[PDB]
Design an enzyme around this catalytic site. Structure first.
Site, PDB file in Angstrom:
ATOM      1  N   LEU A 111      38.720  39.781  22.059  1.00  0.00           N
ATOM      2  CA  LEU A 111      39.999  40.163  21.476  1.00  0.00           C
ATOM      3  C   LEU A 111      40.860  40.973  22.432  1.00  0.00           C
ATOM      4  CD1 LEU A 111      38.876  41.156  17.858  1.00  0.00           C
ATOM      5  CD2 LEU A 111      40.034  39.066  18.583  1.00  0.00           C
ATOM      6  N   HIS A 114      45.297  42.191  20.941  1.00  0.00           N
ATOM      7  CA  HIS A 114      45.562  43.217  19.946  1.00  0.00           C
ATOM      8  C   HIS A 114      45.616  44.582  20.618  1.00  0.00           C
ATOM      9  CE1 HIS A 114      44.382  40.189  16.852  1.00  0.00           C
ATOM     10  NE2 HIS A 114      43.537  39.830  17.801  1.00  0.00           N
ATOM     11  N   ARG A 140      39.729  41.559   3.626  1.00  0.00           N
ATOM     12  CA  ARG A 140      38.761  40.880   4.479  1.00  0.00           C
ATOM     13  C   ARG A 140      37.615  41.835   4.773  1.00  0.00           C
ATOM     14  NH1 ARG A 140      39.469  36.004   8.297  1.00  0.00           N
ATOM     15  NH2 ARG A 140      40.536  37.254   9.889  1.00  0.00           N
ATOM     16  N   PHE A 143      31.585  41.514  11.648  1.00  0.00           N
ATOM     17  CA  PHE A 143      32.790  41.401  12.462  1.00  0.00           C
ATOM     18  C   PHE A 143      33.751  42.568  12.267  1.00  0.00           C
ATOM     19  CE2 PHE A 143      36.554  38.456  13.693  1.00  0.00           C
ATOM     20  CZ  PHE A 143      36.555  39.017  14.955  1.00  0.00           C
ATOM     21  N   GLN A 166      39.142  44.222   7.541  1.00  0.00           N
ATOM     22  CA  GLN A 166      40.582  44.254   7.758  1.00  0.00           C
ATOM     23  C   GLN A 166      41.323  44.471   6.446  1.00  0.00           C
ATOM     24  OE1 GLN A 166      42.244  40.704   9.537  1.00  0.00           O
ATOM     25  NE2 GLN A 166      44.178  40.928   8.420  1.00  0.00           N
ATOM     26  N   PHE A 212      42.476  46.848  11.389  1.00  0.00           N
ATOM     27  CA  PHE A 212      41.109  46.416  11.137  1.00  0.00           C
ATOM     28  C   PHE A 212      40.153  47.313  11.908  1.00  0.00           C
ATOM     29  CE2 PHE A 212      40.200  44.417  15.189  1.00  0.00           C
ATOM     30  CZ  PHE A 212      41.423  43.979  15.645  1.00  0.00           C
ATOM     31  N   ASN A 217      47.761  41.237  14.342  1.00  0.00           N
ATOM     32  CA  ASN A 217      49.006  40.507  14.508  1.00  0.00           C
ATOM     33  C   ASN A 217      48.789  39.032  14.195  1.00  0.00           C
ATOM     34  OD1 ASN A 217      47.459  39.881  16.749  1.00  0.00           O
ATOM     35  ND2 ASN A 217      49.202  39.813  18.157  1.00  0.00           N
TER      36      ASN A 217
END
Ligand SMILES: *[C@@H]1O[C@H](CO)[C@@H](O)[C@H](O)[C@H]1NC(C)=O
Ligand SMILES: *[C@@H]1O[C@H](CO)[C@@H](O)[C@H](O)[C@H]1NC(C)=O
Ligand SMILES: *[C@@H]1O[C@H](CO)[C@@H](O)[C@H](O)[C@H]1NC(C)=O
Ligand SMILES: *[C@@H]1O[C@H](CO)[C@@H](O)[C@H](O)[C@H]1NC(C)=O
Ligand SMILES: [Fe+3]
Lengths: 639, 362, 181
Positions: free
Chosen positions: C125, C129, C58, C63, C66, C116, C105
Site C-alpha cells: 500500500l 495512501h 469493514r 487486514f 476501515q 483505516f 482514498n
C-alpha cells in the site's frame, strides 16, 4: 494564519444552504481576499529573492585542459551552491507550503466565478443592491450564456437605485480593460481618446507578462501513479522539470490574450497594439510616433506589404534624415530576443527528447526550427491539401456528412467492412473484420493471461525485457496498436494527424457466485468526451471528464463466451439503436463525441479480452509513455 | 571470478540481468546445491563490475566535454546558458548510455545495489566455497568481507576457525582490490628497503590512479531517488542534491586503503610526505619543495615541515630556485577545493534546507 | 529517529450494547498538516458533522478495520472540511506494522473522511495512501473489535459504534519509534 480559500468557500456554501445571508457574504468575501493575498505573497517574494541572488556565471574561470575532472567538479559545485542559496531563501520566505495548494475543482469554481453568484444572491437578500449589481455584472461577464443573470440585471436596471456607471468589473485584468475600451473608442473615429488607453494597455501588458512569468515555477506533473516508476538521474530530472517550466512560461502569451467573452484568443496581440497605435497616430497628426510604431511593427513581421507602403508614405511625407534617425522601441526588442531564445531551446528539446511543443506565436522565423522537424511539417502540409482535393472530387460529382467524411481506403489488405455507418443506424460508426489473424489473437491472449486487468504497452515491453512475458507478443501488441491507429486515421478522412491518448489490454472474468439476482446493468450507458447525465440528457465538456479525446476503437480477440455485447444507445440511455457481436479480429470504430453513447452488457461464463484505444487531435495531450515505448522498441530490436 | 573479466570483449553468453542471476544463485543456495550457486554468484559479481565500468566509461565523455562558445546575444542571459549546457550534457549522456551492452538489460533496483555495495554476497560465496573444497577461496572471501565489516561476530568466528586449519595461512588475499593500493604497498616496501628511486616512481605512478578513481566515484553517485513529496522547482531540485551530497561526502573515506585492520589516515598527505623525504634524500630540491608546500596545504598544523620550508626559503638563492617553485601542485589544489567546498556546502545545507520534523527516541 | 506527535484524539467503541475501552491516537502535525487538521476537526465536531455515533463497515480479518463515513453507512459517502475531497500531500511515512492509521482514498487525490487502522505490515500500500497517525494505546480494543463475526460483504453483524470522540492537547512534541504496535 491566513486560512485557505477552500475552507472558507465550504463554510460559505454550507451557510448559503442553511440560509444565513450574513454568514455567506462574510465567508465569500474572506475567501476572495485570501486567494489574492496568497497569490500576491507568492509573487512578491519569489520575485524579490530571485532578484536578490543573481546567477553570476564565471567567464573568467577557464577550466583546466589536462585536469578535466576537477574542472567539471568545480563547475558543478558553484552552480549547485548558488541553487542551494536560492532554495534556502525561498524556504525562508514562503513558510508553510501546504497553504498554497488546493484541488482542481476549487480552481475550477474560482475560474467560473461562483462566489460572485452567491454574493449577489446574498446582497439582494440583504438590500445592498449596489454591490448586488456589481457582483451580478461580474458573474455575467464571466459567464455570457446565462439567461437568469441577464433577467436579474434587467430587473436591477429597471428598479430604481442603480446607475449606469456603477457597472464595474471586479475580476477582469487591467491590461485587457483599456485595450477593449481603447479599440471601441478608435472604432468610433475618435483618435484623441485612443492613444492614452492603448499606451497604457502596452505598459500593463508588459507588467502583467513579467508578473505571470514568475508564477510558473510550480510542482512537477507526474502521470498519475508514474512517480512510483520514476528512475531518472539528477541531470535528467533537472532538465525535465526545467523543460516543463519553460513550456509553462511560453504558454502565458496565449493566456494574456484571451477573454471569456470570446471563444478564441486574440490574433497577434502586441503587433495589433502597434498597428492600432500607428493608425491612430497618423490620424491625429503626430508623424514621428507613427514612423516609430511602424518600424517596431515591421520588426515583428518584416514582409508585410501594406505596412511597408504605410512606412514609405510616411517617409515621403517626412524627411529622409528624420525617418532614418528614429528607430523601434527597446522593450519589443528585448521581448523578441528572449522569446526567440526560449523557442530555440524548446525546439531543440522537442527534436532530441521527443517532448511535444506547439508554437504560440505566428511571427517565428523558420531559422530556429531544426532540419529534422522542418521535414515533418513539410509532409503534414502536403497531406493537408491532398485530402482536401479528394473531398472536392467527391462533392463535385454529387447525407453529405455520411459520405464526405467517411469511406477510407483501408490500406492493409485482408480487411473488409462488415458494417458501414448506415446499417449501424448512426453517424461516425464502422465495424471492420479481420484486422489480425488467429495467431495474433492467441499470442496476445497468452501475453495477457501470463501476467495481468489493464496492462499497457510500455509495461508489457518492460516485463518482456525482464523475462516474464514473451518479447514477441510484446512487440506484436505495439505493431497492432500502430496498425489500428493508421487504419482509424485513414478511414475517417482525417487531414490533421491523429495522436495517441491511452491504450490498455484488459480481461473480464465472470465469477458464477455473484450472478444471482444480478438484474442491474454491468456498465452504465455513457459517453467518453463529456459526462452524460440522467435527467436533461446533456453533457458538459468539463475538466473532471476527458475533453480532449476524439476517436475511440475496440478490438476483440475471442468469441468464446456468452453475453457481454456492445450496443450503441441514444441520449435517453434507454433506447438501444445498434448492437455488435464480438469475434476474432472485429474492430468497432466510432467518434467519442456526444452522438455515440455506448454501453457494455454483463458477461457470463467464459472470458472476454479486448484492447481499448483512445486517440486525440491535440498534440499537447499525447501519450507520454509512447515516447519511452518507442525508445525501448528501437534499442531492443534495432540496435 | 575476476580473472577472466574484460570490459571491452565481454562474453555474450552470461549477459543476463543482475537481479535474475542473484535470485537464481540464492534459490540454488537454499536448495543445498553448491557448484551452481558458486557459478551464479560469480556471474552476478562480474555483472555488477561490468555495470560500474560501463557507468565510468559513459561519464568519461559527456561530463568532461568542452562547450563551444555561444553567440553574442546569449551572453546577457546566464540562466539560459547554464540550463542549455545542462540539456546538452543530458542529451550526450542519453546518447552514450544506449550503446553499451550493460545498459540494454533490466536495471536493478536501489535495494539490490545497496546490498551489493555492502559486500554481502561474499558470505554466501565463502560458505559455498568451503562446502565445495575451495578453502583458499573461502578464506579470501572471508577476509574480503571482514575488511569492509570489521565488527561482525559470526564472520570473526568463521575466520578464527579457518585460521586454525593448517596450510591456509598465506592465502589471505582481498578479492576486491585496486591498483593504487598495490602500487602504494610496493612503494612503502621499497621506501622501507632504503631504496629511493623505486619508491619515487611507484608513488608518482600511484597518485594519478587514486585521483582518477576518486573522481569516477564522485561522478558515479549522482543517481536516482524515491519520490515522496511534490514541491516547487528550486525546493525540489535542492533536495535531490542534498541526498547526492550525502552520498558524495563518504567517497574520500570509502577509497582509503586499510592495512592491519586500520585505515591509513591522511592518505594523500602520506604520499606527499614520502615523496618529499625520498626527494630530499636524493638532494632534488627542484622536485622536493612543491611536495612540502602541498603537505603544508593539507596538514596546516605541522612542525618539522614548517622548519623545513623555512630552511628552504633561507637558502633560496643557492640552488637556483625561483619564487614560483614554492606553489602547491595543481592536483592537490583541485582535491583541496573539491573537498572543502563539499564539506562547507553540506554544513550550510544541514541548517536551512533540511527539514526539522524528526527527533531522537528516548 | 522518529516523527514527532503533536495532538491526541481518543475514541470510545461500543460493540453492540457493550463497551470495550479507549483508543488513543497520536497524529503527526508537523509532517502531515491539512490532514491532522481535518481529522481533529471531524473528531471534535466544530462544524457539527463528525465521527460521533459513526460506524465501522469493514472489519476484514487479518487486514484492517476501515470506517469513518457518517453521511451514509454503505461506504459511498463522507465529506471533509475542505469541500468534498483534497489532494494527497506527501508519502513520507510507510505502513510499518500494526496500528498505523492512514487515509482511505478511491483513486488518486480523492482523500475524504474515511480512515483505516492497519493490523499487519502492508508494504504493497506504500505510495498510494497517506499515513498520519499511530495507535498509541488500546491495541487490545482494536484486536477485540477486529474479530467480530461478519457476513460475506465484510460488514459486521453486530454494529460497532464510536460513542464519543474528543481531543487531548500535547504540551511537548515527542518522537515515537517507527515500529510495530
Ligand atoms: C508627438 O507625441 C509625443 C509624445 O507622445 C510628443 O512629445 C510630441 O510633441 C508630439 N508631436 C508634436 C508635433 O507635438
Ligand atoms: C513489427 O513491425 C515492424 C515494422 O518496422 C517489423 O519490422 C517487425 O517485424 C514487426 N514485428 C511483428 C512481431 O509483427
Ligand atoms: C565519447 O563519445 C564520443 C562519441 O561521439 C567519442 O568520440 C569520444 O571519444 C568519447 N570519449 C572518449 C574519452 O573516448
Ligand atoms: C583552492 O584552494 C584554497 C582552498 O582553501 C582556496 O585558495 C580556494 O578555494 C582555491 N584556490 C583558488 C586559487 O581559487
Ligand atoms: Fe467508453
Amino acid at each position: 494564519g491566513m486560512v485557505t480559500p477552500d475552507l472558507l468557500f465550504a463554510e460559505g456554501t454550507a451557510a448559503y444552504a442553511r440560509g444565513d445571508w450574513p454568514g455567506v457574504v462574510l465567508s465569500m468575501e474572506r475567501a476572495l481576499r485570501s486567494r489574492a493575498a496568497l497569490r500576491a505573497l507568492r509573487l512578491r517574494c519569489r520575485t524579490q529573492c530571485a532578484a536578490d541572488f543573481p546567477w553570476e556565471l564565471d567567464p573568467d574561470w577557464s577550466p583546466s585542459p589536462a585536469q578535466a575532472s576537477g574542472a567539471a567538479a568545480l563547475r558543478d559545485l558553484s552552480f549547485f551552491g548558488g541553487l542551494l542559496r536560492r532554495a534556502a531563501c525561498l524556504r525562508r520566505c514562503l513558510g508553510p507550503p501546504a497553504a498554497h495548494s488546493l484541488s482542481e475543482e476549487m480552481e475550477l469554481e474560482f475560474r467560473k466565478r461562483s462566489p460572485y453568484n452567491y454574493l449577489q444572491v446574498a446582497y439582494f437578500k440583504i438590500n445592498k443592491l449596489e454591490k448586488a449589481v456589481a457582483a451580478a455584472h461580474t458573474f455575467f461577464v464571466g459567464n455570457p450564456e446565462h439567461m437568469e443573470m441577464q433577467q436579474n440585471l434587467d430587473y436591477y436596471q429597471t428598479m430604481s437605485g442603480v446607475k449606469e456607471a456603477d457597472f464595474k468589473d471586479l475580476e477582469t485584468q487591467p491590461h485587457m480593460q483599456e485595450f477593449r475600451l481603447g479599440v471601441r473608442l478608435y472604432s468610433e473615429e475618435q483618435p484623441q481618446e485612443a492613444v492614452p488607453h492603448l499606451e497604457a494597455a502596452l505598459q500593463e501588458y508588459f507588467v502583467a507578462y513579467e508578473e505571470c512569468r514568475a508564477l510558473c515555477e510550480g510542482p512537477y506533473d507526474y502521470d498519475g501513479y508514474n512517480y512510483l516508476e520514476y528512475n531518472a538521474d539528477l541531470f535528467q530530472a533537472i532538465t525535465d522539470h526545467y523543460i516543463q517550466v519553460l513550456n509553462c512560461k511560453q504558454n502565458c502569451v496565449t493566456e494574456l490574450a484571451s477573454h471569456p467573452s470570446r471563444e478564441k484568443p486574440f490574433e497577434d496581440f502586441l503587433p495589433s497594439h502597434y498597428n492600432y497605435l500607428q493608425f491612430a497616430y497618423y490620424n491625429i497628426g503626430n508623424y514621428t510616433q507613427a514612423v516609430e510604431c511602424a518600424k517596431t511593427y515591421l520588426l515583428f513581421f518584416p514582409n508585410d506589404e501594406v505596412m511597408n507602403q504605410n512606412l514609405a508614405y510616411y517617409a515621403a511625407m517626412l524627411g529622409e534624415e528624420h525617418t532614418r534617425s528614429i528607430g523601434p522601441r527597446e522593450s519589443a526588442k528585448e521581448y523578441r530576443q528572449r522569446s526567440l531564445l526560449e523557442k530555440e531551446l524548446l525546439f531543440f528539446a522537442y527534436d532530441v527528447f521527443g517532448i511535444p511543443f506547439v508554437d504560440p506565436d505566428s511571427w517565428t522565423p523558420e531559422e530556429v526550427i531544426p532540419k529534422r522537424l522542418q521535414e515533418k511539417q513539410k509532409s503534414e502540409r502536403e497531406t493537408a491539401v491532398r485530402i482536401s482535393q479528394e473531398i472536392g472530387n467527391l462533392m463535385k460529382e454529387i447525407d453529405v456528412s455520411r459520405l464526405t467524411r467517411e469511406g477510407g481506403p483501408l490500406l492493409y489488405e485482408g480487411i473488409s467492412l462488415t458494417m458501414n455507418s448506415k446499417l449501424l443506424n448512426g453517424s461516425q460508426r464502422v465495424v471492420m473484420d479481420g484486422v489480425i489473424s488467429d495467431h495474433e489473437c492467441q499470442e496476445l491472449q497468452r501475453l495477457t493471461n501470463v501476467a495481468a486487468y489493464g496492462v499497457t504497452v510500455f509495461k508489457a515491453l518492460k516485463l518482456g525485457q525482464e523475462g516474464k512475458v514473451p518479447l514477441q507478443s510484446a512487440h506484436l501488441y505495439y505493431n497492432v496498436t500502430e496498425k489500428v491507429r493508421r487504419i482509424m486515421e485513414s478511414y475517417f478522412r482525417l487531414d490533421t494527424p491523429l495522436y495517441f491518448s491511452y491504450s490498455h489490454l484488459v480481461c473480464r472474468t465472470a465469477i458464477e457466485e455473484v450472478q444471482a439476482e444480478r438484474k442491474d446493468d454491468s456498465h452504465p450507458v455513457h459517453v467518453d468526451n463529456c459526462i452524460l447525465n440522467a435527467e436533461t440528457l446533456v453533457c458538459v465538456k468539463e475538466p473532471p471528464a476527458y475533453t480532449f479525446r476524439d476517436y475511440s476503437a475496440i478490438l476483440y480477440l475471442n468469441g468464446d463466451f456468452d453475453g457481454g455485447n456492445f450496443y450503441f444507445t441514444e441520449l435517453d440511455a434507454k433506447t438501444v439503436t445498434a448492437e455488435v457481436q464480438p469475434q476474432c479480429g472485429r474492430a468497432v470504430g466510432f467518434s467519442s463525441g456526444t452522438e455515440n453513447p455506448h454501453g457494455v452488457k454483463a458477461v457470463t461464463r467464459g472470458q472476454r479480452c479486448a484492447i481499448a484505444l483512445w486517440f486525440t487531435l491535440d498534440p499537447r495531450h499525447s501519450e507520454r509513455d509512447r515516447v519511452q515505448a518507442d525508445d525501448l522498441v528501437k534499442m531492443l530490436f534495432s540496435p | 571470478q575476476y580473472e577472466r573479466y574484460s570490459f571491452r570483449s565481454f562474453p555474450r553468453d552470461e549477459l543476463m540481468p543482475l537481479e535474475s542471476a542473484y535470485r537464481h544463485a540464492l534459490d540454488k543456495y537454499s536448495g543445498e546445491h553448491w557448484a551452481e550457486s558458486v557459478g551464479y554468484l560469480e556471474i552476478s559479481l562480474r555483472l555488477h563490475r561490468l555495470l560500474r565500468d560501463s557507468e565510468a566509461f559513459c561519464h568519461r565523455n559527456c561530463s568532461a566535454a568542452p562547450q563551444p562558445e555561444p553567440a553574442a546575444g546569449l551572453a546577457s542571459y546566464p540562466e539560459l546558458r547554464l540550463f542549455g549546457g545542462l540539456l546538452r550534457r543530458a542529451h550526450c549522456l542519453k546518447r552514450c548510455k544506449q550503446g553499451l551492452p550493460a545498459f540494454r538489460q533490466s536495471q536493478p533496483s536501489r535495494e539490490v545495489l545497496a546490498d551489493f555495495q555492502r559486500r554481502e554476497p561474499y558470505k554466501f560465496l565463502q560458505f559455498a566455497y568451503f562446502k565445495a573444497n575451495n578453502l583458499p577461496k573461502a578464506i579470501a572471501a572471508a577476509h574480503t568481507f571482514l575488511l569492509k565489516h570489521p565488527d561482525d561476530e559470526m564472520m570473526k568466528r568463521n575466520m578464527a576457525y579457518y585460521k586454525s586449519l593448517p596450510g591456509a595461512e598465506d592465502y589471505i588475499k582481498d578479492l576486491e582490490t585496486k591498483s593504487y593500493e598495490s602500487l602504494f604497498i610496493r612503494a612503502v616496501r621499497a621506501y622501507n628497503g632504503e631504496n629511493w628511486r623505486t619508491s619515487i616512481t611507484d608513488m608518482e605512478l600511484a597518485l594519478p590512479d587514486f585521483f582518477k578513481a576518486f573522481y569516477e566515484c564522485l561522478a558515479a553517485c549522482e543517481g536516482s531517488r524515491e519520490i515522496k513529496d511534490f514541491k516547487d522547482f528550486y525546493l525540489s531540485i535542492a533536495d535531490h542534491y542534498v541526498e547526492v551530497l550525502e552520498c558524495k561526502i563518504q567517497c574520500e573515506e570509502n577509497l582509503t586503503p586499510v592495512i592491519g585492520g586500520y585505515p591509513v589516515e591522511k592518505f594523500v598527505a602520506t604520499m606527499y610526505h614520502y615523496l618529499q623525504f625520498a626527494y630530499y634524500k636524493l638532494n632534488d630540491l627542484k622536485n622536493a619543495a612543491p611536495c612540502a608546500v602541498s603537505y603544508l596545504l593539507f596538514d596546516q598544523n605541522d612542525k618539522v615541515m614548517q622548519q623545513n620550508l623555512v630552511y628552504y626559503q633561507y637558502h633560496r638563492d643557492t640552488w637556483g630556485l625561483s619564487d614560483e617553485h614554492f606553489q602547491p601542485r595543481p592536483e592537490a589544489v583541485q582535491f583541496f577545493n573539491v573537498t572543502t567546498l563539499q564539506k562547507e556546502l553540506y554544513d550550510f545545507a544541514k541548517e536551512n534546507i533540511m527539514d526539522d520534523d524528526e527527533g531522537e527516541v528516548v | 529517529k522518529g516523527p514527532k506527535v503533536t495532538v491526541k484524539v481518543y475514541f470510545d467503541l461500543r460493540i453492540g450494547d457493550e463497551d470495550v475501552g479507549r483508543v488513543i491516537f497520536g497524529l503527526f502535525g508537523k509532517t502531515v498538516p491539512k490532514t491532522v487538521d481535518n481529522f481533529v476537526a471531524l473528531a471534535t465536531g466544530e462544524k457539527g458533522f463528525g465521527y460521533k455515533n459513526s460506524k465501522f463497515h469493514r472489519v476484514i480479518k487479518d487486514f484492517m478495520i476501515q470506517g469513518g463515513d457518517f453521511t451514509r453507512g454503505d461506504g459511498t459517502g463522507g465529506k471533509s472540511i475542505y469541500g468534498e475531497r483534497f489532494p494527497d500531500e506527501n508519502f513520507k511515512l510507510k505502513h510499518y506494522g500494526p496500528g498505523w492509521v492512514s487515509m482511505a482514498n478511491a483513486g488518486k487525490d480523492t482523500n475524504g473522511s474515511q480512515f483505516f487502522i492497519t493490523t499487519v505490515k502492508t508494504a504493497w500500500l506504500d505510495g498510494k495512501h497517506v499515513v498520519f497517525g499511530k495507535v498509541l494505546e488500546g491495541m487490545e480494543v482494536v484486536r477485540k473489535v477486529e474479530s467480530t463475526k461478519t457476513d460475506s460483504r465484510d460488514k459486521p453483524l453486530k454494529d460497532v459504534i464510536i460513542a464519543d470522540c474528543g481531543k487531548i492537547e500535547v504540551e511537548k512534541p515527542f518522537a515515537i519509534a517507527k515500529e510495530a504496535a
